[PDB]
C-alpha cells in the first residue's frame, strides 16, 4: 500500500506495476523530457539469493545493446556505502509478457513466427557471447503493443567456459537428470517448450513433480532406452533411473498439432530432442523454413565472447557475507 521511492525529483511515480519477492516496480515520468520509464526498487541485502540474481541482471543488461534484450537506462548511484540499502534500476517499460499474451490473445501463425523469431535472435547473441539464460519461459519474454519482444530475468544466467527455479516446466530433461546444467542446448529446449505453448495455448509439459515432469516429457518425445538413445547420458545412475520409468515410444507430433503449420511442427521437432547434441542451435533455428518471413542473416548479431571472469563470483566457494554482497553490487554500480 505505502510505497516509498527515494529517487531524483526529476521522476514522478505514476503507478505500481508489480510487487515481487525481489521488490517493486513502478512506471514513472521523467519530468524534464516527459519520457516514461519503469523504475525497479530492490532491497536485496537481507535476501542473498536475490542480491546475486540482481548482480547478474545488472551486468548483463548493461552489457548488451540489442533489440531483443531489455534496455537499462540508469542505476541510481548511492551516496554512502553505510546507508546503501536500496537499489533503483531505471529501465524501459514493457507493456506485458508472452505468458499474459498466450492467455488472452488470439494469435495468428504470423504472430507465432514473429515471437519465436525474436526470442531466438536474442538467444543467438547471448550464446555467441558465451551467455546462457538458463530460465527462459513465457513470463520472461516481455512484449509491447507493436509485438516487439525483449528477453529479461537473467538471474540464473551463467558465462560458459544446485539452485532454485520457480518451475521446471521449461527445463531440458538432461539438465534435470545430469550435472550438465550449463549448456547452450538447454536454452533451445526451453524455446521449444515456448514454441509448443504458442501452438497449444497451454504448457506442453506441466509436471506436478520431478518424476512426473520426466514422464510427461517422455510420453511425447519417447522414453530413451537403447545404448544409443542414452549415449548422451554419461552418468550410470541417471541411465538406471531413466530405465526404471514407464517406457513408451515417441508420440506423433502431427497428431498433437493437427491444425499447425507443418513447418512449425518441423522446427519444434528439432528443438524438443532428448540428445542435446542433436538439438538445433539458435543460429540454425533462425535459418529454418518456418521463420523465413523474418530471417535476415545480415541482421542477426552473432555476439562477442565474454570471459568467465565477468561472473568471477561464480568461481569462488568461500561463504559470502551481507557486506560482501553489498560490495559486489556497489562496485558494479560505480564501475
Amino acid at each position: 500500500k505505502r510505497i516509498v521511492y527515494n529517487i531524483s525529483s526529476d521522476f514522478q511515480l505514476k503507478s505500481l506495476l508489480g510487487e515481487g519477492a525481489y521488490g517493486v516496480v513502478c512506471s514513472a515520468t521523467h519530468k524534464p523530457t516527459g519520457e516514461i520509464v519503469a523504475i525497479k526498487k530492490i532491497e536485496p541485502f537481507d535476501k542473498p539469493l536475490f542480491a546475486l540474481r540482481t548482480l547478474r541482471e545488472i551486468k548483463i543488461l548493461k552489457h548488451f545493446k540489442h533489440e531483443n534484450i531489455i534496455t537499462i537506462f540508469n542505476i541510481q548511484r548511492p551516496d554512502s556505502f553505510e546507508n546503501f540499502n536500496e537499489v533503483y534500476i531505471i529501465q524501459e517499460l514493457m507493456q506485458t509478457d508472452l505468458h499474459r499474451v498466450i492467455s488472452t490473445q488470439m494469435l495468428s501463425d504470423d504472430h507465432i513466427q514473429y515471437f519465436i523469431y525474436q526470442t531466438l535472435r536474442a538467444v543467438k547473441v547471448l550464446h555467441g557471447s558465451n551467455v546462457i539464460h538458463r530460465d527462459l519461459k513465457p513470463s520472461n519474454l516481455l512484449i509491447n503493443s507493436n509485438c516487439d519482444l525483449k528477453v529479461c530475468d537473467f538471474g540464473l544466467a551463467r558465462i560458459i567456459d544446485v539452485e532454485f527455479v520457480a518451475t521446471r516446466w521449461y527445463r531440458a530433461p538432461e539438465v534435470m537428470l545430469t550435472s550438465a546444467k550449463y549448456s547452450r542446448a538447454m536454452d533451445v529446449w526451453s524455446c521449444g517448450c515456448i514454441l509448443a505453448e504458442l501452438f497449444l495455448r497451454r504448457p506442453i509439459f506441466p509436471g506436478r513433480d520431478y518424476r512426473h515432469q520426466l514422464l510427461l516429457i517422455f510420453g511425447i518425445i519417447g522414453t530413451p532406452h537403447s545404448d544409443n538413445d542414452l549415449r548422451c547420458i554419461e552418468s550410470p545412475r541417471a541411465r538406471e533411473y531413466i530405465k526404471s520409468l514407464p517406457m513408451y515410444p515417441a508420440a506423433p507430433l502431427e497428431k498433437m498439432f493437427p491444425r499447425v503449420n507443418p513447418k512449425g511442427i518441423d522446427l519444434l521437432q528439432r528443438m524438443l530432442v532428448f540428445d542435446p547434441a542433436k538439438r538445433i542451435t539458435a543460429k540454425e533455428a533462425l535459418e529454418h523454413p518456418y521463420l523465413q518471413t523474418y530471417h535476415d542473416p545480415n541482421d542477426e548479431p552473432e555476439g562477442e565472447p565474454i570471459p568467465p571472469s565477468f561472473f568471477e563470483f561464480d568461481h569462488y566457494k568461500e561463504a559470502l557475507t551481507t557486506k560482501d554482497l553489498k560490495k559486489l553490487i556497489w562496485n558494479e554500480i560505480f564501475s
Binding site: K1, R2, Y5, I7, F11, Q76, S108, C147, H295, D296
Partner: peptide, 19 residues
Amino acid sequence: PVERQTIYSQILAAPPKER
C-alpha cells in the same frame, strides 16, 4: 537531487507483415 516520494496502491497490434 534525491527526494522521497510516496505512492499508495489499489491492444495487441498485428505483427509486421514483412520483416
